[PDB]
Design a binder for these strands. Sequence first.
DNA 1: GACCACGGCGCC
DNA 2: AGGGCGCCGTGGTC
Length: 540
Amino acid sequence: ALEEAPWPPPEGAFVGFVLSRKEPMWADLLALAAARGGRVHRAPEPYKALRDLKEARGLLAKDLSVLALREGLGLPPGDDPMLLAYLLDPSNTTPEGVARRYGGEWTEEAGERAALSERLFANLWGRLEGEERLLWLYREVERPLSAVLAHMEATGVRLDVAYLRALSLEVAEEIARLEAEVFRLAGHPFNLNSRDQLERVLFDELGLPAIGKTEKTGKRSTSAAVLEALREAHPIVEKILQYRELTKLKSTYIDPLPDLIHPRTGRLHTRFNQTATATGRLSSSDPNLQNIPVRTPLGQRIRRAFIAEEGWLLVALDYSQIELRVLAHLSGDENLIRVFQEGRDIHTETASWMFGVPREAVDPLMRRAAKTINFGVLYGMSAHRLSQELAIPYEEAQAFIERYFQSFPKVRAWIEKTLEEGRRRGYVETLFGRRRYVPDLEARVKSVREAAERMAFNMPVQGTAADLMKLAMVKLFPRLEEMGARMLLQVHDELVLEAPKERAEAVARLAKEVMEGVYPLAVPLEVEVGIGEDWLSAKE
DNA sequence: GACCACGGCGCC
DNA sequence: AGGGCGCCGTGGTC
Ligand SMILES: Nc1ccn([C@H]2CC[C@@H](COP(=O)(O)OP(=O)(O)OP(=O)(O)O)O2)c(=O)n1
Ligand SMILES: [Mg+2]
Ligand SMILES: [Mg+2]
């Protein structure tokens, strides 16, 4: 019922747009529109009309901003109803769901999307009236962050395409040797990529013991954890596990990545989704650059393909024991706090016990393997699983889960306190007040209930760490532009920067200080920083 | 060509 | 039976 008015609209209008595809760096701006003051303005030519806007206000404001930056236009994203709804409830991840829940319908017409954005913002803003903690997260964190993420996506990252092309040819030959040996041992060829066909060969034909079942379908599992106990006694299992590793890296990273280079920027562009997680974390998609291999030596080779522009250097900064430090602040445990005040390393100490090796002989590989243990046990890891991963008896596993807790009596108390709030209020909170609704805390089925519990007390820890990182990105970004530096990637507790070689050292120091003193806790926040030509070298 | 579910697995 | 994600190939389908 809005009054149709000719383009352009006045400043402050809510924008509506339609893309040919979800990726703003690859999308064709099909239509553009705006709504304000009971009026709607439809653009005759979307691309030309994009120059008329001063800022992007409305649903998916960041995506339009990325496309604008792609066209060399300085169009910063502003108010976004998606961010408002996401703070009220992280379950609000899609424009279709948000519009349905908060008044309206997500259609495929720009004018209607513009009117929807204006209408959704008014209602959602009313929902936040009174929520001062959520409003603070919106004004001081989420909204300015959308501008930062827009620049990150539009900038992209340089990739050594020729290196990955040559690597693909080499790996393919290595894969052929493994699959050929598997088929020989099986006595017949089959689809090794098919876990169903593999299940028959291993358990029915070869008569191997089945120790685990799948979650949904309840089939005999062929996962790495299951095959691990079988790998040393049987050669074929060893071959499969090696086959799994090669094909995983080749089909997910080595092959698709080089084909995603933008023809105009010459770099690889990912998407940093701001409303996709239930804890407040960001996510990376199309392609996912938050899961680039780093553990295995072969996986490290892939990470070397991520390089800096000529004359530039990569700067990688990582928070040290971030969730363990957050836990000390939230729980207020005197003992755990003093641990960080003395400058101890839990990850190193745990690895010392796992491998029976002095603290001065613990390599990075050993230390990273202890992360799964420390974080695992912390968030309710069964004593059975730990004994299976460490190749140690179940009795030694029980003692470790135990010994992990008595040192800090407050941690147990914080968990139980957190769970009660979730059962009563219906949600749990981070340090800054970010919520997550966990209804299954009172489920009558124990497996479902206990699973919901583990989701419940993990959120304040993972979420707070996410809030700290987001706030750090907001403060650091303008400091990089003034130095001619770039913010490329975010990996939960890691920031990948690109700086000129004559300013790389200065950027590294500044970014480190910003991240460490973004929001002081009861324990000091430490950050490890490295500089290199590639991502792997940038992290020592 | 593409949706949906699943197992599986990469990272944090 | 640690938590949080996204993408792979397969299977079944449309
Ligand atoms: N297996 C893992 C690994 C990590 N995390 C969470 C905890 C911290 C956050 C970042 O991960 P890391 O940086 O790898 O762990 P860290 O404690 O920060 O160790 P480091 O000192 O090496 O950074 O992700 C987790 O839940 N489970
Ligand atoms: Mg870290
Ligand atoms: Mg990290």
